[PDB]
């Protein structure tokens, strides 16, 4: 019994001594002072913040919004900044989106950058002109069986300064909506009840952030037009949650309110005299309408242009009148559409099959020099892989193929 008391007291004193000594060693040896973060060169608007956190949360407070697609976490690759002074060393995950040649300039993903020392950032050429808006839904008309067109009105006459091919970010709070809430006209309804996709419903508990490409050109003031495809569970395993944000925008209707955040973008057209070939499909009609209307109307370019859209049926087609009006007034532009499963009701006398086979066998095969054109493309994933493969077998260089995958 005499040994037990002694053992207990010495155990406790050893543990307490180690804890107190490590605490005291910590108190003197960690700063807890403050560091200053630097932006382009201006002494004004410089961020001071606790060393707790990363560069994303440190930039989030001072009103500087970096492109934070895919909710951070080192996935998108658009949270890239140039750091002049010593920040933090590279991470192997940052090497996935940044190459040894790019990294030399100072490119790093802001998310993995850990703020504990002062830094000097050279942010990409005055992107401080970014806003967070709130808009009133104008219409939510259904454009295809699985694609709905969301229009929004920017309030008080303000207009979004953006370029064709760019995108905005739409944030939504926690909610719960059911697929019975959706206004799906009887024109496109027959395919839904075949799977009875009205069954599903989803709910989220913290707000989400996603990006969407605009479907209007810069000189169409006072609005924003989008094309939003519904993201349903895959056919193989259908017991997984539906798309969080995709099911929200479909739940909106006239008069409702949503918030958007600023103009971004990298899918811009090059300024040359070369011919342009626009390839699209599905929800990829959004940038392809923005690029084409920018060329023929705002820039009024006289280059030769062409649009090759690939749909599944004539009920899946839309914006037809807008393109047929351009092909009549302008003789630089031409339009073609190819269906996979044309139905007898469609009255279809046109191209049939995949778009990568229709484009090749009709136009590219006899072209005098197909390597001399600029190819812009946006569509479903295996449409991008089929087209790129067909173009590479013609000699086209990847410096000419501009592809915008919808978030991989």
């Amino acid at each position: 019994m005499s040994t037990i008391i002694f053992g207990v007291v010495m155990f406790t004193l050893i543990i307490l001594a180690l804890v107190l000594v490590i605490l005291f060693a910590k108190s003197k040896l960690v700063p807890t002072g403050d560091i200053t973060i630097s932006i382009n060169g201006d002494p004004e608007k410089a961020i001071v913040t606790q060393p707790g956190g990363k560069l994303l949360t440190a930039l989030a407070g001072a009103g500087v919004f970096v492109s934070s697609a895919c909710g951070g976490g080192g996935s998108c690759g658009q949270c890239r900044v140039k750091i002049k002074s010593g920040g933090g060393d590279i991470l192997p995950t940052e090497l996935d989106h940044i190459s040894k040649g790019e990294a030399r300039e100072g490119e790093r993903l802001a998310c993995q950058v850990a703020v504990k020392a002062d830094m000097d950032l050279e942010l990409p050429e005055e992107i401080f002109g970014v806003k967070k808006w709130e808009c009133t839904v104008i219409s939510n008309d259904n454009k295809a069986t699985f694609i709905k067109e969301l229009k929004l009105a920017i309030p008080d006459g303000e207009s979004v300064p953006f370029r064709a091919g760019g995108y905005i970010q739409i944030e939504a709070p926690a909610h719960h909506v059911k697929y019975a809430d959706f206004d799906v006209p009887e024109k496109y309804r027959g395919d839904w009840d075949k799977f009875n996709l009205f069954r599903y419903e989803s709910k989220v508990d913290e707000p989400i952030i996603r990006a969407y490409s605009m479907a209007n050109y810069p000189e169409e003031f006072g609005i924003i037009m989008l094309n939003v495809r519904i993201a349903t569970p895959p056919p193989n395993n259908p017991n997984v949650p539906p798309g969080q944000m995709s099911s929200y925008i479909w739940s909106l209707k006239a008069g409702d309110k949503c918030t958007i955040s600023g103009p971004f973008g990298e899918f811009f057209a090059k300024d040359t005299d070369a011919e342009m070939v626009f390839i699209g499909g599905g929800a990829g009609m959004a940038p392809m309408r923005s690029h084409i209307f920018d060329q023929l109307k705002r820039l009024k370019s006289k280059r030769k242009m062409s649009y090759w859209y690939g749909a599944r049926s004539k009920r899946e087609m839309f914006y037809v009148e807008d393109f047929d009006g351009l092909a009549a007034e302008n003789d630089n532009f031409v339009w073609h559409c190819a269906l996979s499963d044309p139905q007898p009701e469609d009255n279809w006398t046109g191209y049939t099959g995949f778009i990568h086979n229709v484009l090749y066998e009709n136009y590219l095969k006899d072209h005098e020099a197909p390597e001399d054109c600029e190819y812009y493309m946006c569509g479903p994933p295996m449409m991008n892989a089929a087209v790129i493969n067909m173009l590479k077998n013609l000699g086209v260089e990847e410096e000419n193929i501009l592809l915008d995958d919808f978030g991989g």
Binding site: I15, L18, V19, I22, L23, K26
Partner: protein
């Protein structure tokens, strides 16, 4: 059932020693005989389960400055109790197991489970994953000790199944099975056999 997945996945799907390199030292050391492998498997099961349980009980109040001190205090107390129990009842196995009874404290399974799962989960699932990881560890230990004791000495659990020549039999024991590289070779070929049947575990050509 939510139980059988959690207890039976770390055996082949997410095996500790064969996929999560944690835990090689005792597997290499104590698998010359099969009794020591069994006793070490049971001890690791007990310690991992109860340490996960207690760390998950007090997960909310642990300071971030002294987290390692608290977790290692719990684990070291459990291992000291286990070592005092082993000496009183199973005396001979302890002598053959001398320092790897204490080294259960620095075994990587016991700490990686307390850090990766117990700090973030309820008490009853942490007992479960500790038991499951102990089972996955004991799988490799017993499988290696079986071959080592059978071919190195011709006995299983101390029972003579192959009659040695120096005991009037026909079998001549392999001396490497009682030595150091044999455990490395056995675990390497076992990893080969496991990744042959479940080929999603194969690593990238890089």
């Amino acid at each position: 059932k939510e139980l059988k997945k959690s207890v039976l996945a770390p055996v082949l799907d997410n095996n500790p020693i064969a996929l999560q390199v944690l835990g090689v030292c005792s597997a290499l050391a104590v698998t010359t005989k099969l009794e020591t492998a069994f006793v070490m498997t049971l001890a690791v099961m007990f310690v991992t389960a109860l340490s996960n349980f207690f760390v998950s009980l007090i997960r909310n109040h642990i300071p971030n400055s002294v987290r390692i001190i608290v977790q290692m205090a719990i684990i070291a107390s459990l291992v000291i109790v286990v070592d005092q129990i082993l000496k009183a009842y199973l005396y001979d196995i302890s002598k053959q197991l001398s320092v790897f009874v204490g080294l259960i404290i620095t075994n990587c399974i016991v700490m990686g489970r307390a850090e990766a799962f117990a700090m973030k989960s309820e008490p009853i699932p942490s007992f479960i994953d500790g038991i499951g990881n102990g089972l996955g560890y004991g799988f490799v230990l017993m499988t290696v000790g079986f071959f080592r004791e059978l071919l190195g000495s011709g006995k299983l659990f101390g029972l003579e199944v192959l009659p040695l020549i120096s005991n009037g039999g026909w079998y001549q024991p392999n001396g490497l099975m009682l030595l150091a590289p044999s455990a490395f070779f056995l675990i390497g070929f076992m990893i080969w056999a496991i990744r042959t049947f479940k080929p999603e575990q194969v690593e990238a050509k890089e």
